């Protein structure tokens, strides 16, 4: 089997991407944030505290003929940005892009933090990291990908995120029309439950490539590119008037600037992030200070290749017995 779904930016900055997901029978379609940095499929629901729901579409298990309470199971998650959610668990039929899993754990939120409530466009998350990070207790649950894997034509999914445009998540196949050149594969460590890999270096603009090992994660659920402070300082030093602002919470730059590209290495291959991808616009409405898309990972404890990096590539998440990542230009 295979599946193919379109993923759409939630706003004009590509802050996140939503993908429609069918849950239950008859289908309830919710727009979920597919997150390769977490392992819970959780949704706004008929159980969510009413004051914490503001425009999201909710899953109502009582209206699904295939929903079953997973008795005794609870979940609670905290993300890198300080947001959180928790609740109870149902099993139900879940379909993405025509690919169906029966008996998928659907984590129903009873509580969500303010950042979720305030984002009316995101109805929940679909985690695509390794199932070792799943928060369900007392019986850990599998991801949608882990449950689908054995049925797929190939044990893979791909992320093809757009810059200010829709893109695609595919399950079970490589679309050889969706990228240019060849795919360069690189080793993955699953020790922390993430798609963790080692970049071979970077370049700033037209500058020379610096060969250096940068361990980090491929995380579709993180907006920005978080890298070591040395690399980030080298990038922003090429932008006149750029500075790190403790008041704003990272590097800002004049909105009049033209940003340089950023290149990262994947083995002997190179992925180029155009300068425009690194512009996250005014820090507040009407400001002439703009927020940078490359930020320091110091204090986060891990480097994160978030959407700013991933949307410059066609990315293969290879879930074979020995997992690997692939990157191609597009
Ligand atoms: Na922000």
UniProtKB/Swiss-Prot annotation:
Belongs to the peptidase A1 family. The active site is at 35, 199. It catalyses: Hydrolysis of proteins with specificity similar to that of pepsin A, prefers hydrophobic residues at P1 and P1', but does not cleave 14-Ala-|-Leu-15 in the B chain of insulin or Z-Glu-Tyr. Clots milk. Disulfide bonds join 255-290. The lineage of its organism: Eukaryota, Fungi, Dikarya, Ascomycota, Pezizomycotina. The gene is EAPA. It is an enzyme of class 3 (hydrolase). Keywords: Aspartyl protease, Disulfide bond, Hydrolase, Protease, Signal, Zymogen. Residues 17-328 form the Peptidase A1 domain. The chain holds residues 90 to 419 of 419 of the full protein. This is Endothiapepsin.
